Amino acid sequence: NPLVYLDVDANGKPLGRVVLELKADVVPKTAENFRALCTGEKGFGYKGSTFHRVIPSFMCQAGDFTNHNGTGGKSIYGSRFPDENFTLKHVGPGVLSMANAGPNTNGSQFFICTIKTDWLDGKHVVFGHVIEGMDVVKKIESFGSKSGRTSKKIVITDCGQLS
Ligand SMILES: Cc1cc(C(=O)O)ccc1-c1ccc(C[C@@H]2NC(=O)[C@]3(Cc4ccccc4)CCCN(C3)C(=O)/C=C/C(=O)NCC[C@@H](C(=O)NCCOCCN)NC(=O)Cc3ccccc3CNC2=O)cc1
């Protein structure tokens, strides 16, 4: 299971680092997409993009590096790739899962849960977990609102692979 990181700021002020373990032992294709989008090694990826939809007591969503609003993103494999499996569940805060627009629409957008989102089980592919920096996730959450609109611009200023 690779480890990756996101460094995040709010209106240009650093919030800190989120470290994520990707469950490549369960969803290796989904993990590999996210890993490569963190490193940028395919020529596109998360660096410079935002947490565009942040809803307290729900989740923090990011990864739309094409349209910055929840309508875009793409995978390293092409526009979409299928739901690899639904083996892992949305068991609590800190779960990392793929955003989608219905079956088999995984691209780049992802979310970090701030509550157990069990109503998403079987609908979104869970593929990793926060290992370090859950406090940074809670900081991101604090910059959200009910509609999802953020009170500050939340930017992934750097990201990459740790192991
Ligand atoms: C890469 C790709 C390729 C192809 C292809 O090549 O063909 C086609 C499509 C994609 C693709 C496109 C978009 C996404 C992200 C997805 N974009 C959206 O859907 C839209 C609509 C859209 C769909 C397709 C294309 C353009 C626009 C754009 C952004 C804002 N839109 C809609 C939303 O906000 C959606 C919210 C929503 O569905 N509301 C339901 C309730 C809510 C919940 O559980 N609420 C309960 C809260 O309780 C808390 C306790 N009280 N569920 C949720 O939020 C569900 C959810 C969960 C986690 C993360 C994201 C989402 C919503 N998905 C989005 O954001 C992803 C992939």
Residue numbers in the entry: 45 to 207
Quoted from the paper:
Cyclophilin D (CypD) is unique as a mitochondrial cyclophilin and a key regulator of the mitochondrial permeability transition pore (mPTP), a transient channel on the inner mitochondrial membrane that opens under oxidative stress or high mitochondrial matrix calcium levels.
We reasoned that establishing favorable interactions with these residues might further improve subtype selectivity. Collectively, these results suggest that carboxylate-containing biphenyl-substituted inhibitors gain CypD potency though a novel interaction that is both charge selective and hydrogen-bond dependent.
